[PDB]
Assembly symmetry: D2
């Protein structure tokens, strides 16, 4: 109808994607793991690798093995079909008070390790 209010659930725009490197014949190096995050981000979002790098803002190869990127919830669903993907999940603050996500910083294709 003209007055219809259809419920619209809230959504998420920060997403964490983990990957499975445990079955590799030869274990990937940390930089090889990050290269694979970049390629998977581009494959899932369907953009250039340079474009995918500007969407990513953090990743880890230690505490966990995954990356974090700005994307819509609809975009996050595109990763369900990809090889090696484990968790697709909204990112949440490790420091809610300071509004900081966890992992190492990833900015402009450059990794900054964080303790």
């Amino acid at each position: 109808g003209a007055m219809t209010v259809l419920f619209e659930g809230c959504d998420y725009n920060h997403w964490l994607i983990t990957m499975d490197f445990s079955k590799e014949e030869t274990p990937k190096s940390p930089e090889e793991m990050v290269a694979a995050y970049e390629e998977t981000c581009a494959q899932g979002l369907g953009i250039s690798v340079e474009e995918a790098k500007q969407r990513m803002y953090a990743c880890s190869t230690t505490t966990y093995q995954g990356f974090q990127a700005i994307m819509t919830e609809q975009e996050s669903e595109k990763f369900k079909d990809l090889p090696g993907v484990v968790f697709i999940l909204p990112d949440s603050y490790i420091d809610p008070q300071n509004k900081e996500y966890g992992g190492d910083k990833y900015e402009n294709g450059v990794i900054t390790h964080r303790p």
Copy 2:
């Protein structure tokens, strides 16, 4: 991937649909509003009125004017195009401890006023 775990959020299978009867020139009676709930539920789900009456579990013509039925989110979306529909919303327990929804109980057309 084979072990992908996609977070989609949880699903709702109980839906409240409220109706606007404020614009018709002839004000409807209680049983006339309930008859309109049944026909709206049938039209929106694409099923017979006899079947829609089995899906419905509560309604009101006093506290509110609307009805509640078991359906999926994909099904409830289709009510957005029907005349007179106001709110389409996941239903919630009036009495969470006893897992009770609000409104009058509706049992295949037999209606019991909630104390």
Copy 3:
């Protein structure tokens, strides 16, 4: 842990609250219904009617009988034991692409009948 990522579900900051006036002796005028919305909003937020008027942004006395205000989930929860409150639900757009909520527009007590 210092690297714990606790899931933070998404939330809602626009809330629709409907009212039951069916039981009352003499049916309320539209202006009386709107005054009831302001008193209820003030009580649920724990503030004055003057302050609550600034939080409201829409209401209806026809299509539905309720008001809409900006508030958090924790604030919306405080309406649950107020007299005559029926539904407490997140507000959603009647026109999603244009980001417009439904009902009549409400700005500090001045209502604009939305055609």
Copy 4:
């Protein structure tokens, strides 16, 4: 009021909790990581180990390093303060048609590997 229906978002009772074993000079064996899952579960739920093992239904030391257990959202929030916890999130089906969670099956200390 007696008719108030407060929008209850849907609640989660299946939770995934991952762990950080990356700091240890000598990495933990699979059996040591599983034993650490049981100890974390008991400590986070505030229950005995035997009671905690009853709540657990799946885990991994390979694809990911974590366990999944029945618990309320209020209970999972308590793991945010335990050492070595990384993710706390609601579990989701790897196969939505069969309603099966991922990871190896855990039944009270018995692990059945599932590919």
